Design a protein around this ligand. Structure first.
Ligand SMILES: O=C(O)C1=CC(=O)[C@@H](O)[C@H](O)C1
Ligand SMILES: O=C(O)C1=CC(=O)[C@@H](O)[C@H](O)C1
Ligand SMILES: O=C(O)C1=CC(=O)[C@@H](O)[C@H](O)C1
Lengths: 145, 145, 145
């Protein structure tokens, strides 16, 4: 369209930023994250929607909807689904014309062993990890490149 | 009843047949598949319902509903849930009087390593793989045997 | 509050107690279990809610709601999600002020290999297994200690 259209998907538990495990995920809350993204996109003339769900199937539904509605790019933090949801992987693979960047707040490489592997990353166009909430902004920049 | 009653369940991403990964899943779309099944069942005097969902829990709900509504057989392509959904496995095991056939469009034996194992198949009465959309018809035939 | 508030969460397939695999899960049905819990809690002046869902995301939603509504303790039988749902694990970890006890009806240690490991248990305050429906009562007692 006339402006780039990005969808930011946050997966399960991400609406509990600021409540959950503060030493790992930071002190700022989910509303803070959404506001940060919205204000950054406004400043870049990027249309953005921030979506969050705890449901694997709803995430997939939202990726499918992005196919039909002119979405150019997806920034996705699948939450714990990163480590096991082959269904979200297949959904991301099904939208071949949408650029996708995976984001993790924490340095997943240095946490529990099960967090070291992402089953979604192989079908994404990029990734970021371990940069805190700024990783979302870095992902937007990757898409707006 | 007076006629065999079959439920066909398609799991996540299967509504994107014809859009997704065409070299793997074929050129025909989900509506084509549903029509094919409906016309074949009509010709055999089989009552059929085709259902699709991206939600693991909705699949389980639909299997449970089949217990109460006189369903004789289930044809199920769990999609990527095949490889990890012990919850769908348990659901299929919970309906001991319903015959179940698992279907895969693609030859999962010759794809990525994670696609080689099915956690749902051990509780099904049969399976088909690698026959394209015709596998659904072959599954119906297995049930109508 | 004036009385302890407990939430009992049953995961997928548990509403099919008494129908499913009777040699493993027992002859009594889910309504029997709910009644048993309700009558025991009434006798102890404990406020209880019994919730069941087949949906992973709904379970997570319900754990999150417990954060806001003054829930003191959760008894959770995740069903098959025990073996793979890192998303439910993270949800349980996100509610650091709610005591959590994991329950399994069957002796999961002596069943199929995939049932031997729980990804949810490491973030719970306790567990019970292999005691039949009485395990739920034992879990309530653990919380009311
Ligand atoms: O944002 C992140 O780093 C992550 C979020 C989740 O919620 C985790 O399950 C994941 O392992 C790491
Ligand atoms: O129909 C199939 O062959 C399959 C469908 C899915 O959607 C896949 O995740 C699965 O590994 C194979
Ligand atoms: O209550 C239990 O013992 C269990 C319930 C489930 O429904 C199972 O998938 C799990 O492995 C054991």
């Amino acid at each position: 369209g006339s402006h780039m259209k990005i969808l930011v998907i946050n997966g399960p538990n991400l609406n509990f930023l600021g409540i959950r495990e503060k030493n790992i995920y930071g002190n700022e809350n989910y509303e803070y994250l959404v506001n940060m993204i919205n204000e950054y996109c406004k400043s870049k003339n990027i249309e953005v929607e921030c979506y969050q769900s705890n449901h694997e199937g709803a995430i997939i539904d939202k990726i499918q909807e992005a196919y039909f509605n002119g979405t150019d790019g997806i920034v996705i933090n699948p939450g714990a689904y990163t480590h096991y949801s082959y269904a979200i992987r297949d959904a991301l693979a099904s939208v071949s014309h949408i650029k996708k960047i995976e984001v993790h707040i924490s340095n997943v490489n240095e946490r529990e062993e099960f967090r070291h592997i992402s089953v979604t990353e192989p079908v994404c166009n990029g990734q970021i990890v371990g940069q805190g909430l700024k990783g979302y902004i870095m992902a937007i920049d990757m898409l707006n490149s």
